[PDB]
């Protein structure tokens, strides 16, 4: 027949076997679960603060929570867009209590990262061309962005194991408290945008969803739950250190750049394209437009700082070490090419090492339009990185500079945006850049972990598979839920309750701008805590 | 303390079996529908799982435009059916099977998703191949997959007969006028085979279980309103909205092909345009309508088309030739002087090279805000009745490039369902609200739950792990009148003088029953009342 | 608040609680990520050693392999193969002082680690590393130096601690065999290997998530060891001894290289789709391809046909014509067209299989600032097949002709690509050469194929997009159960899977039929892992 013959033969008995092909299926609790949505109550250093109250006899149990945003109609003059998934980068603070306290509470940045390989929920709460794309307003009543809802996807312990896993309400009142960012870390803009009107006109405007289940003769049993707290370390410290640790699930160890000593303000910005490339070729078409020019004479339109030279026959121009091929195709006979051979310039010595932005392009071919009186550039051989791309403004212009450092034109200078996102990790957009070279975990006197390489990252990103991990040590390797977690446990008489992170930071060159970009040592500590539901909702700390 | 064991377990010795790939060859039989039989009986076939349909796709000869639908395997399905001599065990409606395997990157690209297969291929010669013979694969997901040997359809002592019903081809091709669609539909013939995994089981330990069977309910058009009854123990309720293409030719202006990104529809969409957008002509242009507006460029570069600027500058022009633009290509207005949706008002600069060599305009870069709903209006809407002006004032050239499109698994009223049409959602269980939504939260906590994205508005009222354990259910209530799930949707209002308004829709309501597997004297199913 | 429908449906039969759980305590273990530096040894193939041996150390499991990039500098044209970090490894073996506990040949490993992208990521997949560099001076920086993570999947990381490697006082020894560096790098001739093979050395350490168990309940587990048998050179059959108790069965096809230099013509980097492949291919061939020359081109061999444009802009190369318009031209300046860049044939006056025949339609604009061709549009018929043809073949002793007519310039250019895991005859394995597939056991047929069946439920049951032809016996649940695998039977000879294809011929005058193919059969044989006194495997008869 259909079965082979050697088969049969094979098969057509005293031993115990699991049957693999039938199941007994087990009658569940009864239940009937519903999507409730739910409007807060907002009050107002005047930061906006969502209040969520989840009361009702009937709500047994409630699992993933969804924060949904109402964006308004952006109008007016100037250039505006939102960061990438901009209802993430909203919240502040999110906290889950009873009337008998916190039950569970994460930063903003914390439950982002936990959702970073969440591609739905990074969708769902803002990542499109019409949100994250920098769009422009020409008149006063000209619509720069239209109105938009965005998805905020709250993931929490709870759902972990779905119903088994759900935060049970022993009849007790439940409060989702979501602290907001100011709006100017959610938004990119130019100077034009008359952001100080904005920022008094914008409100956020949430609804809380969550799935709810009416159980039928309810049984609850305790459980555990990992609660999640961060140390930031001081400026330019290569150590954090977080106290009170007596029983750990694990520890992750990240770095995030300071901008208070600038103005926040960059050259260019890629938009909703957010590829490391994507960044790199924002920057080069901005640089482009005042790097070579095909003029009637010498340029006008520059500071005096400017070194523009005319581009010789042979078409090399030679920036001391750097030589630098120009050759554009169709330029009139009354017009010449031109070179601004120190575009951006860095030095701390009148006569040391300089970071020229000239010096960083070998060839620029291209096109000159008699239509549109411009060159259109054809290829650019250039050596720009996403750190280049990374530098605030301030940096170029700072004291510390005994340049002029921006001998941009005033056009190119109009165009630069400010920057605010407040989940930027490393010295770069991309966090590309690993500027540790070394990592120290210290339970007390002992080392307790210690990496040259980043072999935690390594780990994480594989044992979560994630392509956006961070040095983590995973102490509990035992299934959630059903278990209680491994954690790392303390000894109070011998000093090990903490755990103190340091870090040896590559060493840059002074005469880089990036050098001056100040940073912050992040560590993140999920402690073990157990869940009562005798009298109420409440959670201990294990110790 | 007493701990368990997470060093170590021990190897349960399982059940003895011998699995095998078994594929087989069907019965054809022609509305004169095509139908496929597949008939499994075999004494050693103990129990199946994995149902995989492939498909012979033949050698397209000819002239004229012609191209396969994207995952054109599962397009060409329109029903399947699993039964017995008891009589059906589980059936899915193409779409709904098509739906089921959307998350499935695999399963699609087996059932044909390559530039060989849906890039729009031109034939020059009768005898030119314009695609050449390929084989797609079909995954025909069923609830016998889920847990594996666990959920595995057993037919010990029983003849189980799959049968597949086929969509007409037209649905699976993309083609213009040019193609020879009616010798091609002539000659056209499904050549199936099914193939599936076979479990050889010594002492089977047969128990009955449970299956989910899904329930399509399709309102009529621009009904927002559709009825699924006799709902006495769903797990789940999908809805979504089909556009309705009858009153039109299922004509379209262009078509991305292999690509099929937001932007790749757009980009096919301007690039058709800019053919009859820009022209360098020696004098006005010839070969358009009489109702066209040819406008020469300015020294400026700039045309006004109302509040609309339009800046077209063209290098390289011949002395004896000037730069046109067609001020409206594409125009509607359901009323003399009300609002007029313009195509060339979507457009607000145009760079590019004029070739000596090739006589033709090169485009550099385009600035517009042409959308996916654009590119997704049938020509038919543009010279429609409601339509005061003549609408497509495009060249003779351009019409005849125009590509019919007949794939049967649209969503939306856009070609990637990016627009969303329902305002508000309301299902009721009886004459009571069951759940009632402003926002599709639905669709997301859908999208969340299944990690897809492209989910519905789905009702899921089954959290308790599959196979394990019996389904959570919505519970009726025949006495108080609760056993049917009546759906009711408020549509988006949109702009009369839009040509989108026009598109007709269909709500599409899906409801998943709990029905007992017995297998008592062979394999049969019985709803759960 | 719930809707009053859902109250009054709910508002005596055992119950399953699905709203909450009783926390089992688990094993009283404590996890550490420990990384080895390893013992180098030297026809003359590196060998890298590792050995454990921790009281601290109960259980091991998830194996990582860095390896340190060195800074290449020099001259010439380099790049790393995609995936750098699997490429490098030949075999790989998990033994005890009992012998060999686990051990995998290296493209194994790779094809279990091709359906994980972040596995594959970390191995080295970036610009930086897989793009062709080139250097300018002989201490120009063509590489800087980077690390590699290669993850060693093994059949202990399926459930985490339960079917971890447990070391019951006993001495594991993980020994990796290193590829010759050839294997891994994309060069030109202008590069200076030669120096480079006698300078580079593998800088290997070994890490693993280790644990410390207190009170370990050892148990015995059962265990899957791939085993691979190379068919001989372009035979269709293969087969594999002493089969009793497999669990699955792989069959594909390798090219061989070694009846040529392994140059190819192009190389597209980073950048791996099919697309990428062809674009790259006839980017090189444009070059010479499209001629804007002050009367007949030079520099080119006198076998060349290289035939000025018509004002027409078509040029008919027999049955092909080739429409040509280039903007721009000097009016000192023609357009020429090289008819017979690459040409092959076995007999003077029969079919010819010619690269420029493959074009349609050639557009672009010459450039007088760069005196060179910018091209706009190409419309060809270039395959995955044409992009994977070395350049050997095209100058063989069956051509009739000279066979490629291209310039000294472009030939400076080739690279030779060496990588160890290349499938089918094309390097993207896009081409199906096996029509038939036979699999017997013993004398008996077990299985037989006349399309890829095998291979689309590979793909789907792995959630691969790179699956092979695979025989699975095991539908079971690993680590919880034991597998379910073929049984032998040695009184009737039914003791090992013989495999038979039917290849599919390619014309004799097309270049790629002159690739050498090699049948590779993979069995996972089934083994029982036993702790008594001390780690050991036996294999399940």
Redesign the interface.
């Known amino acids: 027949?259909?079965?082979?013959?050697?088969?049969?033969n094979?098969?057509?008995?005293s031993?115990?076997?699991?049957?693999?092909?039938?199941?007994?299926?087990?009658?569940?609790?009864?239940?009937?679960?519903?999507?409730?949505?739910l409007s807060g109550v907002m009050t107002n250093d005047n930061q906006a603060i969502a209040s969520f109250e989840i009361r009702?006899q009937?709500?047994?149990?409630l699992n993933?929570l969804?924060l949904?945003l109402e964006l308004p109609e952006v109008k007016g003059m100037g250039r505006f867009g939102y960061v990438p998934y901009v209802g993430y980068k909203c919240i502040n603070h999110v906290s889950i209590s009873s009337c008998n306290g916190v039950i569970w509470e994460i930063e903003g940045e914390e439950l982002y990262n936990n959702c970073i390989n969440?591609?739905?929920?990074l969708?769902?709460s803002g990542y499109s061309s019409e949100l994250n794309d920098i769009s422009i307003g020409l008149t006063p009543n000209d619509t720069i962005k239209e109105p938009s809802?965005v998805?905020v996807?709250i993931k929490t312990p709870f759902d972990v194991?779905?119903?088994?896993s759900?935060l049970?309400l022993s009849d007790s009142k439940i409060t989702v408290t979501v602290t907001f960012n100011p709006v100017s870390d959610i938004v990119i803009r130019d100077s034009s945008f008359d952001f100080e009107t904005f920022n008094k006109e914008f409100v956020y405007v949430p609804e809380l969803?969550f799935?709810?289940?009416?159980?039928?003769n309810?049984?609850?049993?305790?459980?555990?739950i990992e609660k999640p707290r961060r140390v930031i370390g001081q400026i330019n410290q290569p150590t954090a250190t977080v106290t009170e640790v007596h029983a750990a699930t694990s520890l992750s160890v990240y770095t995030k750049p300071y901008y208070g000593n600038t103005d926040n303000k960059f050259i260019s910005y890629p938009g909703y394209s957010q590829d490391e490339?994507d960044y790199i070729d924002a920057y080069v078409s901005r640089l482009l437009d005042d790097l070579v020019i095909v003029s009637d004479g010498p340029p006008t339109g520059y500071p005096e700082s400017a070194e523009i030279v005319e581009v010789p026959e042979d078409?090399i121009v030679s920036i001391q070490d750097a030589d630098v091929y120009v050759?554009?195709?169709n330029v009139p006979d009354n017009m010449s090419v031109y070179l601004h051979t120190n575009l951006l310039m860095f030095g701390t010595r009148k006569n040391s090492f300089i970071y020229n932005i000239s010096k960083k392009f070998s060839a620029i071919?291209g096109?000159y339009?008699?239509?549109?009186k411009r060159t259109?550039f054809?290829h650019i051989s250039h050596s720009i990185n996403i750190i280049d791309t990374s530098i605030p403004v301030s940096l170029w212009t700072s004291q510390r500079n005994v340049y002029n450092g921006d001998n941009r034109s005033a056009e190119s200078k109009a165009k630069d945006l400010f920057i605010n996102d407040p989940f930027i990790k490393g010295i770069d957009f991309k966090n590309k850049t690993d500027i540790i070279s070394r990592l120290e975990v210290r339970f007390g006197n002992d080392v307790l972990?210690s990496?040259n390489?980043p072999?935690?990252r390594?780990?994480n990103?594989?044992?979560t598979?994630?392509?956006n991990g961070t040095r983590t040590?995973?102490?509990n390797?035992?299934?959630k839920?059903?278990?209680?977690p491994?954690t790392?446990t303390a000894n109070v008489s011998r000093g090990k309750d903490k755990l103190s992170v340091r870090v040896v930071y590559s060493t840059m060159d002074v005469n880089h701008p990036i050098y001056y970009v100040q940073k912050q040592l992040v560590v993140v500590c999920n402690d073990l805590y157990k869940v009562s539901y005798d009298q109420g909702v409440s959670i201990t700390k294990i110790m």
Request: aromatic share 14%.
């Open positions: 027949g259909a079965m082979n013959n050697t088969i049969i094979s098969l057509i008995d031993i115990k076997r699991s049957n693999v092909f039938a199941v007994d299926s087990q009658i569940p609790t009864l239940y009937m679960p519903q999507y409730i949505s009702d009937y709500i047994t149990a993933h969804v949904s969440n591609t739905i929920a969708k769902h809802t998805y996807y194991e779905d119903t088994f759900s049970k969803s799935i709810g289940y009416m159980v039928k309810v049984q609850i049993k305790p459980s555990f490339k078409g050759k554009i195709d071919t096109t339009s008699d239509a549109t259109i054809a972990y990496e390489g072999i935690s390594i780990y990103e594989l044992l598979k994630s392509n040590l995973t102490f390797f035992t299934p839920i059903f278990f209680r491994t790392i």
